[PDB]
Design an enzyme around this catalytic site. Structure first.
Site, PDB file in Angstrom:
ATOM      1  N   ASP A 117       0.744  -1.153  -0.028  1.00  0.00           N
ATOM      2  CA  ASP A 117       0.004  -0.032   0.148  1.00  0.00           C
ATOM      3  C   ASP A 117       0.934   1.342  -0.051  1.00  0.00           C
ATOM      4  O   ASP A 117       1.445   1.733   1.024  1.00  0.00           O
ATOM      5  CB  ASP A 117      -1.002   0.001   1.247  1.00  0.00           C
ATOM      6  CG  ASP A 117      -1.937   1.157   1.424  1.00  0.00           C
ATOM      7  OD1 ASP A 117      -1.907   1.996   0.237  1.00  0.00           O
ATOM      8  OD2 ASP A 117      -2.454   1.126   2.311  1.00  0.00           O
TER       9      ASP A 117
ATOM     10  N   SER B 100      -0.499  15.709 -12.161  1.00  0.00           N
ATOM     11  CA  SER B 100      -0.792  15.174 -13.362  1.00  0.00           C
ATOM     12  C   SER B 100      -1.137  16.651 -14.387  1.00  0.00           C
ATOM     13  O   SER B 100      -1.645  17.598 -13.930  1.00  0.00           O
ATOM     14  CB  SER B 100      -1.829  14.336 -13.719  1.00  0.00           C
ATOM     15  OG  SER B 100      -2.535  14.029 -15.045  1.00  0.00           O
TER      16      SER B 100
HETATM   17  N1  LIG Z   1      -4.349   3.442   0.445  1.00  0.00           N
HETATM   18  C1  LIG Z   1      -4.360   4.072   1.737  1.00  0.00           C
HETATM   19  C2  LIG Z   1      -5.188   5.195   1.811  1.00  0.00           C
HETATM   20  C3  LIG Z   1      -6.523   5.114   1.874  1.00  0.00           C
HETATM   21  C4  LIG Z   1      -6.921   6.560   1.845  1.00  0.00           C
HETATM   22  C5  LIG Z   1      -6.342   7.690   1.891  1.00  0.00           C
HETATM   23  C6  LIG Z   1      -7.266   9.143   1.691  1.00  0.00           C
HETATM   24  F1  LIG Z   1      -8.658   8.836   1.752  1.00  0.00           F
HETATM   25  F2  LIG Z   1      -7.150   9.714   2.818  1.00  0.00           F
HETATM   26  F3  LIG Z   1      -6.641   9.666   0.737  1.00  0.00           F
HETATM   27  C7  LIG Z   1      -5.196   7.753   1.669  1.00  0.00           C
HETATM   28  C8  LIG Z   1      -4.341   6.623   1.553  1.00  0.00           C
HETATM   29  N1  LIG Z   2      -6.117   1.701   1.219  1.00  0.00           N
HETATM   30  C1  LIG Z   2      -5.772   0.799   2.279  1.00  0.00           C
HETATM   31  C2  LIG Z   2      -6.983  -0.544   2.199  1.00  0.00           C
HETATM   32  C3  LIG Z   2      -6.589  -1.881   1.624  1.00  0.00           C
HETATM   33  C4  LIG Z   2      -7.436  -2.734   1.645  1.00  0.00           C
HETATM   34  C5  LIG Z   2      -8.602  -2.374   2.144  1.00  0.00           C
HETATM   35  C6  LIG Z   2      -9.673  -3.683   2.147  1.00  0.00           C
HETATM   36  F1  LIG Z   2      -9.821  -4.289   0.742  1.00  0.00           F
HETATM   37  F2  LIG Z   2      -9.192  -4.621   2.874  1.00  0.00           F
HETATM   38  F3  LIG Z   2     -10.942  -3.258   2.421  1.00  0.00           F
HETATM   39  C7  LIG Z   2      -8.797  -1.242   3.005  1.00  0.00           C
HETATM   40  C8  LIG Z   2      -8.068  -0.358   2.901  1.00  0.00           C
END
Ligand SMILES: NCc1ccc(C(F)(F)F)cc1
Ligand SMILES: NCc1ccc(C(F)(F)F)cc1
EC number: 3.4.23.22
Length: 330
Positions: free
Chosen positions: A35, A199
């Site tokens: 992630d 972008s």
């Molecule tokens: N994949 C992690 C993640 C999930 C949500 C956000 C948000 F909503 F804060 F932009 C940032 C990072």
């Molecule tokens: N962005 C981080 C994240 C990754 C996976 C999930 C899930 F799929 F497990 F719900 C939630 C949040």
């Protein structure tokens, strides 16, 4: 040193990607969600509330000869989708595709939200944003990437996500056989702790390219592409019968429609997302309404270049002292 690991979609829609990771001595292999939008390495464990575990592989620190409890440390995280988890902290040896880091903070979940329990295929997350976002208290901990940086041949990692197919995460080197043409690099702001970049515009299908600055984050941990309402409306206007549905929570379209491509700008270069990448299938089993892979960021507060966009490119995360993002066609 370098590392290389295969990443695999968890279902037929590419909702997420899992990558095997070795933790502890002897190795306990868990499938983690890499992630780039978060900075915690956390896992289902023997400490997780039993009712909150449904098929996941668990990390058992008591069976690892190198695990050490980090006394007094706790962690608690909430993701932008409303998911959350929390627990305590061990340090242990962590290896990704041949690349080993000793003394990595491994955050053991005591409590997980329902969305994690119901995802039997994901054993935890491996955060790859900047270490300023790590939630360990009272002593903040470094990500796997930050801990490996010194010993890597090059302070980079690359994401090569597949469309309905396996892909590759590489650490420490750039595979020049994995992309076509040249890599275009663009500046990153770390001020919010994300891989945040700008972008240079977009186009819908074969339409004219609109030059306009779209600030957003490169997030392997988010499934879809979240963009400003003006851009998203311009895209779905080209799909007959598409509409924003409040009950569904986004744009839907007739499953019989053909979707146009979406192009986004990286400096002077262009990354083209094929229309098929934007189809996320029926909203419910048997429905003829399909869910769109491009959605509005209005309710979120930030634009997110998630897997829908990233899997159309070879992406370099350059963690040099001045960090940059590289994009290439593939
Ligand atoms: N994949 C992690 C993640 C999930 C949500 C956000 C948000 F909503 F804060 F932009 C940032 C990072
Ligand atoms: N962005 C981080 C994240 C990754 C996976 C999930 C899930 F799929 F497990 F719900 C939630 C949040």
């Amino acid at each position: 040193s370098t590392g290389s690991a295969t990443t695999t979609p968890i279902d037929s829609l590419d909702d997420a990607y899992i990558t095997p990771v070795q933790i502890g001595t002897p190795a306990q292999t868990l499938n983690l969600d890499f992630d780039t939008g978060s900075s915690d390495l956390w896992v289902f464990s023997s400490e997780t509330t039993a009712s909150e575990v449904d098929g996941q592989t668990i990390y058992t620190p008591s069976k690892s000869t190198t695990a050490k409890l980090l006394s007094g440390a706790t962690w608690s995280i909430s993701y932008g989708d409303g998911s959350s988890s929390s627990g305590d902290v061990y340090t242990d040896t962590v290896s990704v595709g041949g690349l080993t880091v000793t003394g990595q903070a491994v955050e053991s979940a005591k409590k997980v939200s329902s969305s994690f329990t119901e995802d039997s295929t994901i054993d935890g997350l491996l955060g790859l944003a900047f270490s300023t976002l790590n939630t360990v208290s009272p002593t903040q901990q470094k990500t796997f990437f930050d801990n490996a940086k010194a010993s890597l041949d090059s302070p980079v990692f690359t994401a090569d996500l597949g469309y309905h197919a396996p892909g590759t995460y590489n650490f420490g080197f750039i595979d020049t056989t994995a992309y076509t043409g040249s890599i275009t690099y663009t500046a990153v702001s770390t001020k919010q702790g994300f891989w945040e970049w700008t972008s240079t515009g977009y186009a819908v299908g074969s339409g004219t390219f609109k030059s306009t600055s779209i600030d957003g984050i490169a997030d392997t941990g988010t499934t879809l592409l979240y963009l400003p309402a003006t851009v998203v409306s311009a895209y779905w206007a080209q799909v007959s019968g598409a509409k924003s549905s409040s009950s569904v929570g986004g744009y839907v379209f007739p499953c019989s429609a053909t979707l146009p491509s979406f192009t986004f700008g990286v400096g002077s270069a262009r990354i083209v997302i094929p229309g098929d990448y934007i189809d996320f299938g029926p909203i419910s089993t048997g429905s003829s309404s399909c869910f769109g892979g491009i959605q509005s960021s209005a309710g979120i507060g930030i634009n997110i270049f998630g897997d829908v966009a990233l899997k159309a490119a070879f992406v370099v995360f350059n963690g040099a002292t001045t960090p940059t993002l590289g994009f290439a066609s593939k």
